DNA sequence: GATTGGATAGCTATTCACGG
DNA sequence: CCGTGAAT
DNA sequence: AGCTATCCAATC
């Protein structure tokens, strides 16, 4: 309860006081600082007429918790959920404002009973603040007291996130959306004399800006208004039907026309339907993009940033670092503008490894406590006391280093960030476990057998496999010719397919001579403590058992169960036996069903729904093949340029004494003399280690050349051994060049043998990691 | 209430159950992993007879919170105050153990009533856990129930601190103290095949390691035993007399002899007196070292680390950074092995600036809110939302950049860290405000007037000042000839010296047409809120006042005292008007006394006590003088070496076409022919950038070198323009060399004029900072 | 009791889907 | 009712 | 994102 009352709140001047609701604590501090500006300006808000309160992060969604029931007289009353009534934030809001769940406030006399004139929401300009928190608050108010919105009881504090200043002019130009900002920027010829400022939340606007904004306080308050359509909109974005969200979120967001925003800014009334259509839709699309993995990479945006930052950090030396320090480094270098605790949790999850864990091939090696098979991995240590390091042996084979220069990249404010997506050697999307929800769709994936995947890919790329010709299709690409069965690496149970569903069964053994029943393997991905709690809550099963206990150490589980005398007969009697599941498995809940929700995010943004793992594999193959071809082409261009440069270098070295470079005056004279002598001008910085640059860029930049590759020659290279090593290197480049030229004309596509070798290397690395419990050089 | 009771604990097997008291959740996880072993370690501890509890706090010193009173029955009883009774950790411990404060437990019958047979402390091996926590626990038990310590009711878990593994062997060796490991390693012939591992606490250990520890569990439990001496020793370390700690902590810790440690490791019993004399004394000495400033530098260890880290970080660019990110950088790069919140608080305190603050000259510019005169500076923002940057001008003028290469340094694991101490141009120890306690001592300093300090230093250095001669002493250097008065920069009150004490007075005015009392200034360093609460607390003062009001701005003080009508008379009558302070000041408490406790830390460890600021200045002067001399000599030597190198380089570049280096085969042939031609062999890397080498190191490593400075020359240098620039550089270096030679011979000591120029520069920087409210290029 | 600095770490609730 | 990851 | 208590000393 962070309420800071107003002096006139609840008194005879209640109908002109204001209540400020802050998204978090930074907004609280900014509001307090602005309010405590008395005696410097008689005009402006102050604590005698304004309130102060905090919402505390995400607020609850009332539209799902409430349930509508009709009465005898046809009245429809909304019963509020037990959890809904016990929420502290909503209770505090309703107590401070003195709202009633029975009065409809249809008349001004009823509106006079509230303790404040109006409620003003102060939230950040980011997607989360404007779309989720404000949207949820609007949904709450619309659901319970729709009439309040009509009479302008709900207002918001609109603050820009972009400010462009021009030196010599004291007033800036403010943009509330990036679209209008960049449209204005591209409209102008040059902004080199200007300066742009972003505001990631209300943790900005230095005291000068705070004073300037609070001077014109009334110019920032915007009143929400209601229309007819908004009703059916509020049900779509916050109702209990996810099908409507699926249909709504399958398309993009249409921005507001100029007339609409002109009316909004001239009158300062915002229709809630427009707010839902723009801000909430944008937030939901961003949430989909953040919480659902890409079908090529298999990882979400946060995990991709983590991997890129880890590669950058541990490229120098693979030394352990604290999770907090590494997360801070990642947030600093990868431009992660969210809370650090979420990043640390994501790192910890990515580094975990145990039977049944989400990652079969984690990209990190964890030093410390990183969860266990029991407790579902939630028993991990704090990020301040555990360390992670790069599993370089597996990474350098799964994500080839030379292919990183060719992926499309994500640019923030003109700076490079983590790539848009990686293209692994083997399809990682269908090679690991995962399960989590998002807006509209849910994602769930059970890993496939490694041997089946290897056989399929080797058939596709081998050109010598007896099944290669039929894997390629001259009829259609829906037929299945090879099995893709669920993996059972760390699983001692069984997997059986019935109809269209795969079921996993744990294994047990029964010693009737003593009346003891012991289970030795639980089904796939079930925590032991959760399983024990589940088997204890069922009183029907609990009746037969005297006691159950465990002696599982850290990775192998066994439960021993002593049940009441002469209970087995009743066990078979009450619990039916079927070919899908026997009496004992039904009794002990040793059967699990593997449901798959193959919903991913396509490279160009958006969602995509698959029907089988074969579709994912067939979609992933062309990207990898094209990446191989592009890599080879750029490699050939680089070799040609490098050969030309090295031949010129050797030619200069041969006759360096004759030239007598010391005789000439300066750089330009020497360059002119060299050009007169026939030395070609190249781009040394673009050829010795080019860039993320592409091939046409390579040619264009190599067109304009300098003579720096001669002037930067150390005297040590002028000896004889250096020249001999240089010509040997030239021979090696020539051999590599004609080898890759031969590789280019290869069937079925260029670089098939390279793919085969990478497959073998990654298979060996995976085997080595499995042998040492995924702790390389630590066994 | 973290507590997992043992199965047998409660009164049936209470005599064999043991309770493990740990530090944090890391120890909890380690102990849980050890105890959960089953069917793989049958002879080992388990939850049948092992307790589990977390302290979850810090232990209060009970010896200071109790009162001993003798009743009429000739019995001395100890009554505990409210805070001791209400402490959560002690209450939990006494409830779990079921201790009685009336039973003396002198026999086995009363001891059997306890819920556990023994209590085992499981703390880290660092100074904190071993010293502070264990000493406080032992003090608690000895104060209340000595017989429990006598009968071995208290034990500790002794875990190895450092372990070295022999490659090819599965058994390492263990050391519990750093000195033992250091002695063994120095005595050991070679350790290339040996792998050392530090265990900072027990949060980091191998699974096989903990498996072995719980395989041999009783080998790591040591019982504490009492003796005759300890009865008084506790009173020295935890009693109410600080003089005993002053007399005890003024010397180093005497290590345990070989016979004592051999007996301890043989019988597994530890005398409590030895533990107090070693671990607690070491911890207290470390606390003194890290909580009291150095009299030369003027800052503590944490502040020195912060300053060095800021200098290293903001060198590339002065762009602002968030406080938490900068703290993470400092912790990473200078090996800060403590919590991040402490570092963030220290940085915030170092960057603060307001009237009456502790830092008249902050080493940081703070963007955001950093507190104000009211609330004493505790109203600053969160470290995640306020930015800091380096005050480049003041730092560069106060701590010269070159001198940083010549200070003694602190080494961690063979790597450099923050300097041992800094030697600023002006003595910063007596130009700031400070007040804080530490073990056995208190530090309190009131800043001196800048003008007096400048005059004193100049008279000591100018050699032309008419006061220079008698400032030096041919009779005795324990006399004062110049004033040293408290500074009044942001002070509009009065300062008056009476006897041996300075007093600060506020300023007040009176108006008789209402009898309005207006306070325009408070004494030095008193927050407004605390003063208001103090004036309200005393009944006899505000009983004559109805109201008090204050419209105080961010930097101004005004208090209006709405007091009773016709009241002045008994204010004069009651509150006595003395020559030291008038009745009105006595009635508003506007007089303060400036007490100074000048206790500092010597450069080579230890504490030192001064009697006046003149002593501090006199001690500080020779260090700066010697540093100036050493800097001048090192620069002279470096200049000579660089002149030789550049002359040789010029000669080569001049006659390079003659030798025709292309003819020779490899590096050795080129070196041989160069030596034959007479080019001297030097250490190019050292002379180009020594950065830490002493004056003798330059000479010793000059002759042993290579011919790298020739073979690393590029073609661009062979041109005429490069040679002309080189010869111009040679001329400039010669001019600087003979200028330095002139500076070397200079009365009274070398480099006096340099000191004068730097004094003028720092004075100008200070004035510029004062004029812009210590916000450079931000006004 | 209060007050100053530099050190000790672990809790506080939700949103989004779709099956148990 | 619970439970997953990524966010306030 | 914030919120939770104590140790040292000497004067108030
Ligand atoms: C409802 O969200 C919060 C409420 C409170 N206090 S209350 C009204 O329930 O008595 C405090 C914090 C939060 N929000 C939380 C977070 C917000 C931002 C970032 C991390 C957060 N982590 C939280 C963890 C547990 C509970 C609330 C958190
Ligand atoms: C659980 O919190 C604490 C645990 C300990 N454990 S131990 C054996 O090292 O003494 C010690 C102290 C705390 N409490 C802490 C705080 C309590 C109140 C207010 C602020 C606190 N700040 C802390 C900062 C770091 C560590 C513990 C703190
Ligand atoms: Mg935000
Ligand atoms: Mg510790
Ligand atoms: Mg910690």
Residue numbers in the entry:
A (entry chain B), B (entry chain A): 416 to 1194
How do the authors describe this structure?
The African swine fever virus (ASFV) type II topoisomerase (Topo II), pP1192R, is the only known Topo II expressed by mammalian viruses and is essential for ASFV replication in the host cytoplasm. In ASFV, a functional viral Topo II pP1192R has been identified, encoded by a viral gene conserved in ASFV strains, P1192R. pP1192R is detectable at an intermediate to late stage of ASFV infection, mainly within the cytoplasmic virus factory, and has been confirmed to be important for ASFV replication. Topo IIAs exhibit a 2-fold symmetry and comprise two functional domains: an ATPase domain and a DNA binding/cleavage domain. The mechanism of enzymatic action involves the opening and closing of three gate-like dimeric interfaces, which are called the N-, DNA- and C-gate, respectively, upon ATP binding and hydrolysis and DNA cleavage that introduces a double-strand break in the DNA (G-segment) trapped in the DNA-gate for transport of another DNA strand (T-segment).
To this end, the cryo-EM sample of DNA-bound pP1192R was prepared by adding both a DNA duplex, m-AMSA, and AMP-PNP. The high quality EM map allow us to build the atomic model of the pP1192R DNA-binding/cleavage domain in complex with both DNA duplex and m-AMSA. Secondary structural elements of the protein, all the DNA base pairs, two m-AMSA molecules, and ions (presumably Mg2+ as it presents in the buffer) were well resolved. The overall configuration of the complex resembles the drug-poisoned cleavage complex of eukaryotic and prokaryotic Topo IIAs, with the C-gate adopting a closed conformation. As presented in other Topo IIA-DNA complexes, the DNA duplex was trapped in the DNA-gate and symmetrically kinked by intercalation of a proline (P852) from each protomer into the DNA minor groove at two points. In one strand, the rupture of the phosphodiester bond was observed between –1 and +1 nucleotides, with the 5′-phosphate of the +1 adenine covalently attached to catalytic tyrosine (Y800) of the cleavage active site, confirming the formation of the cleavage complex, and a m-AMSA molecule was found wedged into the DNA base pair stacks (+1/+4 and –1/+5) flanking the cleaved scissile phosphate. However, there was coherent density in the EM map of the other DNA strand, with no phosphodiester bond break was found at the expected scissile phosphate, indicating a pre-cleavage state. Moreover, an extra density appeared bridging the phenolic hydroxyl group of the Y800 and the 5′ phosphate of +1 adenine, reminiscent of the position of the metal ion A2+ proposed in the intermediate state of the classical two-metal catalysis model. Since the DNA strand is intact at Site 2 and no m-AMSA orientation consistent with that in Site 2 was found at the site of DNA strand break, we propose that m-AMSA in the Site 2-like orientation may impede the function of pP1192R by preventing DNA cleavage and stabilizing a pre-cleavage enzyme–DNA complex.
